[PDB]
Symmetry: C2
Subunit: 153 residues, 2 copies
């Protein structure tokens, strides 16, 4: 089960698609952070969700907000996928330990070994202010993410 | 340590790039099996290795032998990579549990969470007849594999 609103966002340091280290706490005091967990690269549903994030990127990656996509895939996988899909935002690798970050946020699927489609908004204080789990047969509403971020400014 | 010649090749059941199950024991009493463990899809080092396999595929995949590539990546990853590289042989997913099959063959890298570049030849009885792990920094000479399979007829 997902970490609830008001809980302290577990810290993490993960490799992005270009092998750079990205730390959640690096955004404390500066930007609200949108964490988009997704199951697998090269799958239709994740493609659609990240394509929509790509299309509305300025509403998520700006002076007040940062957007980080997270999955169990390693950087080379995310690099190729990001290049083909045109993703310029960071795709982080919760690869080894496998899904450690996903488990900390309570969005890890132990049966399949992938992250569930959970989204969080972490405020400037490192506190989770928004938490949304994707429901069966549907895509997450991203207007809801922009509004949640806009509300924290 | 890596499993060496004389040992029983641990049995496995894994999904190939097209989600079809592939078991090692299915080849016993029929074909010699080349097991090629590789670290990560979309990396130059693994590309070079599997390209060499692809370029000489008829010598490994015939009436007397089959070739299986294995790594920790999931099927969608291998599917896309196989399509881009023109790989027609099975790329199996040692994805969940993470690196289980690789750990059973003693070719799993615990620091990086990937399989080391290990190659095995399993004969019709299920015994390892060839076992070689890539000297990281040096490239695998695949004519040594063909000779290993040549001696099993």
């Amino acid at each position: 089960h997902m970490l609830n609103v008001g809980a302290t966002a577990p810290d993490f340091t993960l490799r992005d698609q270009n092998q750079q280290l990205v730390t959640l706490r690096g955004y404390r005091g500066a930007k609200n952070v949108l964490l988009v967990f997704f199951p697998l690269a090269f799958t239709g549903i994740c493609q659609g969700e990240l394509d929509q994030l790509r299309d509305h990127l300025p509403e998520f990656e700006n002076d007040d907000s940062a957007a980080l996509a997270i999955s169990v895939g390693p950087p080379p996988t995310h690099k190729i996928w990001a290049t083909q899909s045109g993703f310029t935002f960071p795709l982080l690798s919760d690869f080894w330990p496998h899904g450690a970050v996903s488990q900390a946020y309570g969005v890890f699927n132990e049966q399949a070994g992938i992250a569930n489609a959970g989204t969080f908004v972490v405020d400037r204080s490192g506190i989770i202010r928004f938490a949304e789990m994707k429901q069966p047969g549907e895509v997450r509403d991203q207007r809801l993410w922009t509004d949640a971020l806009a509300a924290l400014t």
